[PDB]
Design a protein around this nucleic acid. Structure first.
Ligand SMILES: [Ca+2]
Length: 314
DNA sequence: GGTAGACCTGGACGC
DNA sequence: GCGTCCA
DNA sequence: GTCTACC
């Protein structure tokens, strides 16, 4: 009853709503599609994870987004706490308006879009996003998810326990920068990326000015921000773009990897023109990225997510 | 400047 | 069952 | 995917 992960049915008095149609958000389409790797559908249609340093379970109906929080006496979320949810899902950005525009300028996006509504971008914490994606290079979403999990249990603050699941907050810079962190990560199976995590944590804290240097990129320009990130070990154009798009408020950023290449070739018959190479390469990926921006506009990254997400789901 | 190859790891094929 | 793929 | 050795 008062134990385990909650469900809307089981503990009615403990949930609160947020007007939000599925047309504007589909948890099942955004939470497991490679934006964040920390949400789990513990119960059908119920997703649990850490959001703004507290554990939440989310679930939706046709017109509402139901929220519950586990912090004191168990109670429904407060308006302020809920706002944190609204901010996390950038619910101010209207998806109907964006889909309309992308659809207007892209007959293909229109077709695909009809079947995959509610795919939007989560507004993630810079740090969690930096290291989670440092873990994403040359690797699949399933492993990535596990790695990030083991990483948070070993170095993140212990939050609360639900059933046999103990939640952890994402590790701090100091923690990741710690002595012997890499060796520990290797044992947790992060592979050669173990070194990137340790190295980037130290680089940020000991060479770039700390947390402030990262949190300052939100005011910077996509171009600036992207160049800065690339300095860090294990962070290339692709990783940098994900961070730009998902944590640094650069909605025009478009991550180019195997998925978008297939899409570009199969659905747009795209080919590199200025670049030197015919296949994937630093020059061509950059070009593909430009192609998508000119096609979709300032929120290309968000559009990219729609097709990217609808691709995984097929 | 613009390539090739190696690289931790493990669920997927495919023979 | 194993070696090559591939994310 | 990122990084490094190399024409
Ligand atoms: Ca590959």
């Amino acid at each position: 009853g008062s134990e385990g992960h909650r469900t809307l049915a089981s503990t009615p008095a403990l949930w609160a709503s947020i007007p939000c149609p599925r047309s504007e958000l589909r948890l099942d389409l955004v939470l497991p599609s490679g934006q964040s790797f920390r949400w789990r559908e513990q119960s059908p249609a119920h997703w649990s994870g850490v959001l703004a340093d507290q554990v939440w379970t989310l679930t939706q109906t046709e017109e509402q987004l139901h929220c519950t929080v586990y912090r004191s006496q168990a109670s429904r979320p407060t308006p302020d706490e809920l706002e944190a949810v609204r901010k996390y899902f950038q619910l101010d950005v209207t998806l109907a308006q964006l889909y309309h525009h992308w659809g207007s300028v892209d007959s293909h996006f229109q077709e695909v879009a009809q079947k995959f509504q509610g795919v939007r971008l989560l507004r993630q914490d810079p740090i969690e996003c930096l290291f989670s994606f440092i873990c994403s290079s040359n690797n699949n979403i399933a492993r990535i998810t596990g790695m990030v999990e083991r990483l948070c249990q070993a170095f993140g603050p212990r939050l609360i326990q639900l059933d046999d699941v103990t939640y952890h907050g994402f590790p701090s810079l100091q923690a990741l920068a710690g002595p012997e962190v890499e060796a520990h990560l290797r044992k947790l199976g992060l592979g050669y990326r173990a070194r990137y995590v340790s190295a980037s944590a130290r680089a940020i804290l000991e060479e770039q000015g700390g947390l402030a240097w990262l949190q300052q990129l939100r005011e910077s320009s996509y171009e600036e921000a992207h160049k800065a990130l690339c300095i860090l070990p294990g962070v290339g154009t692709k990783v940098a773009d994900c961070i730009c798009l998902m944590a640094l408020d650069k909605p025009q950023a478009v991550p180019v990897e195997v998925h978008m290449w297939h899409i570009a070739q199969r659905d747009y018959s795209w080919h590199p023109t200025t670049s030197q190479a015919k296949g994937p390469s630093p020059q061509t990926n950059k070009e593909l990225g430009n192609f998508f921006r000119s096609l979709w506009g300032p929120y290309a990254g968000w559009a990219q997510a729609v097709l990217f997400s609808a691709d995984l789901r097929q």
